[PDB]
Every structure is written in C-alpha cells, then in structure tokens.
Design a binder for this molecule. Structure first.
Ligand code: V78
Ligand code: CL
Ligand code: CL
Ligand code: CL
Lengths: 99, 99
C-alpha cells in the first residue's frame, strides 16, 4: 500500500493470534508494544523516547503480521503510550519513505 | 527521493536561517526541534512520547525547507533529545510510506 500522513499511520497487526492496532513509526529504531504475554525468555532493554527512558522486556524471533505482511523479529514489551512498529520490522515488510 | 529504512532517516532541514539535521518520523504528530530561536508569537504545550511528557514552545506558520522542498507549519521547540520532523510537515512535502 501507499500510506499518506494526513492521519496517524495506524495499522492492524497480528501477534500471538490476536489483532492489535499499531503505529508505523519511521522515527523508532525498535518495535514496542503495550503490556502483553509472549513466549520464551526475555532480556532487559532500556529505550529512550521524547520524554525519557523506560525499561522494557525484549523478546526475539517473534512472529508478527503487519498489515498482512509476515515478519519475524524482536518485539519489546513495556509501558509505551501506544503500540509502535519500528524500523526493525518496517525493513522486513519492505517499507520505504517516498516523496 | 526514496528513503530506505535500514538506517535512521535523517535529512537536512533549513529553518530560521539555520541548517539542522532531523529525523523523518511518521509516528510523530508534530515537528519538534532542540532549543533554538524563532520569530513571532508562541504558546506553551506539553507533548508526550515514550518516557512521558516535555514542555515545549509552539510557533505557528514557520517556513521550513526539507530536502529541497519548501513548506510552512507549526514547529515545537524544547528539550527534545533529537530533532524530529512530524506528519504536519511530512504531508506538505508529499511524503508517503510505501510497501
Ligand atoms: C533511538 O531510540 C528510539 O528509536 N526511540 C524511539 C522514539 O521514541 N524515537 N523517536 C520517535 C518519536 C516517537 C513517537 O513517534 C512515538 C509515539 C509516542 C507516543 C504516541 C505516538 C507515537 C502517542 C502520543 C501522541 C502524540 N505523541 C507524538 O506524536 C510524539 C511526538 C510529539 C514526538 N511521537 C513519538 O514520541 C524519537 C526519539 C529518538 C531518540 C531518542 C533518544 C535519543 S537519546 C535518548 C532518546 C528520543 C526520541 C522509541 C519509540 C523506540 C522510544
Ligand atoms: Cl528484529
Ligand atoms: Cl502545522
Ligand atoms: Cl497527498
């Protein structure tokens, strides 16, 4: 698809069999979701945003569908204000910025 | 241009007679720059991201040039950890996400 930016670029993702809404964010290195359960072991990560730093749980090699495009990669889980899909997954689904 | 997302999508902007580097951020409603002087009226605003909120000054109708493309819009100025170009200016240079 081609997504213009007059509204927030919110898309449906699927992860762990569940649909969620998430924001496609080219300004984010990483993908970070609101509290949820994921399988396996996690590692610690501190990520920085506009307001400061939060601690999140890092899960690797997680399957996630983004607008129907399949990806498998690192998902961070923590107290984010919204679900955000960052460049780690945007690259997997072949996203670019164009003007 | 077509901008890949293997790396952070940094561009040069011209604003208030200054050249600055900024991040093209489809997840940002607003454009926020580190402390700088701008002409004209402003009003205070709180903006939120990962890590919580910061207080910024909101300047309206500011001319900016981004990768050779002229636009005009609201620019927020304050203690942001990095310069971000948000959707309010990305729309004006005809920037889209594609995959
Ligand atoms: C390299 O680290 C990162 O990629 N951080 C990422 C990130 O925050 N990077 N930044 C992109 C902006 C994040 C976000 O689009 C992400 C975002 C957060 C909240 C919301 C939407 C989108 C809902 C709140 C509504 C309105 N909020 C915003 O639109 C704000 C803008 C006012 C900035 N939008 C955002 O803050 C900008 C940003 C980049 C770097 C840094 C750091 C540099 S040094 C320490 C931090 C801070 C902010 C992230 C998501 C993993 C925490
Ligand atoms: Cl990844
Ligand atoms: Cl504007
Ligand atoms: Cl358009």
């Amino acid at each position: 698809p081609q997504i213009t930016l007059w509204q927030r670029p919110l898309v449906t993702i699927k992860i762990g069999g569940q649909l969620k809404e998430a924001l496609l964010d080219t300004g984010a290195d990483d993908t970070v979701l609101e509290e949820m359960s994921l399988p396996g072991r996690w590692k610690p990560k501190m990520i920085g945003g506009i307001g400061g730093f939060i601690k999140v749980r890092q899960y690797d090699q997680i399957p996630i569908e983004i607008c129907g495009h399949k990806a498998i990669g690192t998902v961070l889980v923590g107290p984010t204000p919204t679900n955000v899909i960052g460049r780690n997954l945007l690259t997997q689904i072949g996203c670019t910025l164009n003007f």
